[PDB]
Design a protein around this nucleic acid. Sequence first.
RNA 1: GCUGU
RNA 2: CGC
RNA 3: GCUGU
Length: 67
Amino acid sequence: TDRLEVCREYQRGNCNRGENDCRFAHPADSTMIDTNDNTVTVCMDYIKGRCSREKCKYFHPPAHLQA
RNA sequence: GCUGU
RNA sequence: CGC
RNA sequence: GCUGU
Ligand SMILES: [Zn+2]
Ligand SMILES: [Zn+2]
């Protein structure tokens, strides 16, 4: 559960659904995208409510993208 | 740099 | 979010 | 049971 696929329409500035209603990740630009399968690394601490980093390297998925 | 019960 |  | 460019 540590990888999520990025929204292509978000990446080309084009998501009419918006982050809340989109089934794909809308990550921050500082988060590294694996260009081979267009995914981002999920913050596993965040899934458990235990990420306290001021600037985390990984994606914090909204609840609708999880479990 | 986290993922393991 | 062209398979 | 359809929603996705
Ligand atoms: Zn989107
Ligand atoms: Zn985090």
